[PDB]
Design an enzyme around this catalytic site. Sequence first.
Site, mmCIF file in Angstrom:
data_model
loop_
_atom_site.group_PDB
_atom_site.id
_atom_site.type_symbol
_atom_site.label_atom_id
_atom_site.label_comp_id
_atom_site.label_asym_id
_atom_site.label_seq_id
_atom_site.Cartn_x
_atom_site.Cartn_y
_atom_site.Cartn_z
ATOM 1 N N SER A 181 4.314 2.603 8.080
ATOM 2 C CA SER A 181 3.956 1.477 7.078
ATOM 3 C C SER A 181 5.080 1.175 6.315
ATOM 4 C CB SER A 181 3.087 2.156 6.095
ATOM 5 O OG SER A 181 1.624 2.277 6.509
ATOM 6 N N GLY A 182 5.177 -0.320 6.020
ATOM 7 C CA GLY A 182 6.331 -0.986 5.244
ATOM 8 C C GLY A 182 7.376 -1.039 6.014
ATOM 9 N N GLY A 241 3.125 6.689 8.637
ATOM 10 C CA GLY A 241 4.525 6.809 8.253
ATOM 11 C C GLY A 241 5.433 5.386 8.653
ATOM 12 N N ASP A 301 0.054 -7.722 1.768
ATOM 13 C CA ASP A 301 0.383 -6.229 1.778
ATOM 14 C C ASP A 301 1.981 -6.448 1.741
ATOM 15 O OD1 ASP A 301 0.578 -3.549 1.755
ATOM 16 O OD2 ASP A 301 -0.199 -3.348 3.756
ATOM 17 N N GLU A 330 19.847 6.740 6.942
ATOM 18 C CA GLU A 330 19.169 7.696 7.679
ATOM 19 C C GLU A 330 18.939 7.544 9.109
ATOM 20 O OE1 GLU A 330 18.561 10.676 7.064
ATOM 21 O OE2 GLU A 330 16.825 10.628 5.662
ATOM 22 N N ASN A 340 18.055 11.268 11.011
ATOM 23 C CA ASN A 340 17.254 12.154 11.328
ATOM 24 C C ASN A 340 16.726 12.855 9.764
ATOM 25 O OD1 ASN A 340 16.507 14.962 11.420
ATOM 26 N ND2 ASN A 340 17.567 15.076 13.500
ATOM 27 N N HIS A 346 0.853 -1.210 0.053
ATOM 28 C CA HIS A 346 0.040 0.058 0.040
ATOM 29 C C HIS A 346 0.845 1.502 0.128
ATOM 30 C CE1 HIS A 346 0.340 0.055 4.378
ATOM 31 N NE2 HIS A 346 0.436 1.162 4.347
HETATM 32 C C1 LIG Z 1 1.340 3.708 7.316
HETATM 33 O O1 LIG Z 1 2.247 4.078 7.871
HETATM 34 C C2 LIG Z 1 0.044 3.290 8.028
HETATM 35 N N1 LIG Z 1 -0.935 2.234 7.375
HETATM 36 C C3 LIG Z 1 -1.991 2.854 7.128
HETATM 37 O O2 LIG Z 1 -2.537 3.989 7.456
HETATM 38 C C4 LIG Z 1 -2.919 1.740 6.711
HETATM 39 C C5 LIG Z 1 -3.015 1.814 4.994
HETATM 40 C C6 LIG Z 1 -4.296 1.927 4.577
HETATM 41 C C7 LIG Z 1 -5.376 2.458 5.861
HETATM 42 N N2 LIG Z 1 -4.373 2.044 7.043
HETATM 43 C C8 LIG Z 1 -4.595 1.727 8.255
HETATM 44 O O3 LIG Z 1 -4.077 1.506 9.156
HETATM 45 C C9 LIG Z 1 -6.288 2.152 8.501
HETATM 46 N N3 LIG Z 1 -6.967 1.120 8.649
HETATM 47 C C10 LIG Z 1 -7.860 0.427 7.818
HETATM 48 O O4 LIG Z 1 -7.999 0.922 7.039
HETATM 49 C C11 LIG Z 1 -8.596 -0.712 8.325
HETATM 50 C C12 LIG Z 1 -9.039 -1.096 9.596
HETATM 51 C C13 LIG Z 1 -9.634 -2.135 9.948
HETATM 52 C C14 LIG Z 1 -10.181 -2.826 8.814
HETATM 53 C C15 LIG Z 1 -10.836 -4.549 9.203
HETATM 54 O O5 LIG Z 1 -11.298 -4.848 8.234
HETATM 55 O O6 LIG Z 1 -10.886 -4.591 10.375
HETATM 56 C C16 LIG Z 1 -9.890 -2.597 7.613
HETATM 57 C C17 LIG Z 1 -8.987 -1.514 7.292
HETATM 58 C C18 LIG Z 1 -6.363 3.217 9.631
HETATM 59 C C19 LIG Z 1 -7.769 3.637 10.068
HETATM 60 C C20 LIG Z 1 -5.508 4.548 9.337
HETATM 61 C C21 LIG Z 1 0.263 2.850 9.537
HETATM 62 C C22 LIG Z 1 -0.903 3.030 10.523
HETATM 63 C C23 LIG Z 1 0.894 1.463 9.759
HETATM 64 C C24 LIG Z 1 0.909 4.521 6.052
HETATM 65 F F1 LIG Z 1 0.108 3.974 5.181
HETATM 66 F F2 LIG Z 1 1.917 4.536 5.038
HETATM 67 F F3 LIG Z 1 0.360 5.714 6.630
HETATM 68 CA CA LIG Z 2 19.543 12.906 7.650
#
Ligand SMILES: *[C@](=O)([C]([N]C(=O)[C]1[C][C][C]N1C(=O)[C]([N]C(=O)C1=[C][C]=C(C([O])=O)[C]=[C]1)[C]([C])[C])[C]([C])[C])C(F)(F)F
Ligand SMILES: [Ca+2]
Length: 240
Positions: free
Chosen positions: A188-189, A186, A93, A59, A61, A45
Amino acid sequence: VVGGTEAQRNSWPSQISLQYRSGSSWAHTCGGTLIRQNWVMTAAHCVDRELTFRVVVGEHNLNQNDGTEQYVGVQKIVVHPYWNTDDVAAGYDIALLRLAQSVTLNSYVQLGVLPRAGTILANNSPCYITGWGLTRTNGQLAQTLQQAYLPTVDYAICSSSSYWGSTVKNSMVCAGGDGVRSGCQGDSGGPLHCLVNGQYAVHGVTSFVSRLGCNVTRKPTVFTRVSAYISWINNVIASN
Ligand SMILES: *[C@](=O)([C]([N]C(=O)[C]1[C][C][C]N1C(=O)[C]([N]C(=O)C1=[C][C]=C(C([O])=O)[C]=[C]1)[C]([C])[C])[C]([C])[C])C(F)(F)F
Ligand SMILES: [Ca+2]
């Protein structure tokens, strides 16, 4: 990372920052794990979006010269073929990024160790999340890399009604859920590093949190389980 502490510069050398171009500047959007000198593992995602990316290794800071950074373009993105855009709870994912050049290894830049295929962690296993993500729900990014202790919650507990119910699949890892510490936007991944037989290995790719906030009691951060994807990883690297 909510509830984190600042990581030392050389504790988590496989962590990368995945950035996108925003006009004339670059902005952090996700973490990732360096797995070969020219491959990064991250979340699908993060990269199924209309953006131009680069990777920064070494990295610490985001807003200051650390003197250790290497900046590298992304040449090819391979998303898991079963990933469905903006459907995190279906799983899959995970994505691999082939870098435009190989990076050099040093005490700040090392390959992440992956678990053996099929490995599952005992309940309450010791793991750390790392990242530059929000330090509070609806807060702001961290400047310096943060870590938080997030012990695992096994599949039988995580999939129970009081936790994540049938949202969580066996191809995911749950960690945390204390209401204080969590991943957040932020992060994520990026990696979940877990201590197994004396060595930290990357068991998770940070995926999603609850609709109620980042740090929510009995809603652990949810990660893609790396050990469910080792054949896929190796097949992609061998074919590219
Ligand atoms: C990451 O840094 C970030 N991940 C997210 O924001 C992910 C990416 C899609 C939206 N998301 C979420 O964590 C969101 N949750 C859901 O969309 C969700 C929750 C529950 C269910 C279910 O079926 O039970 C389905 C979907 C929340 C609401 C933000 C972080 C948090 C790891 C990045 F995407 F880059 F921002
Ligand atoms: Ca730096």
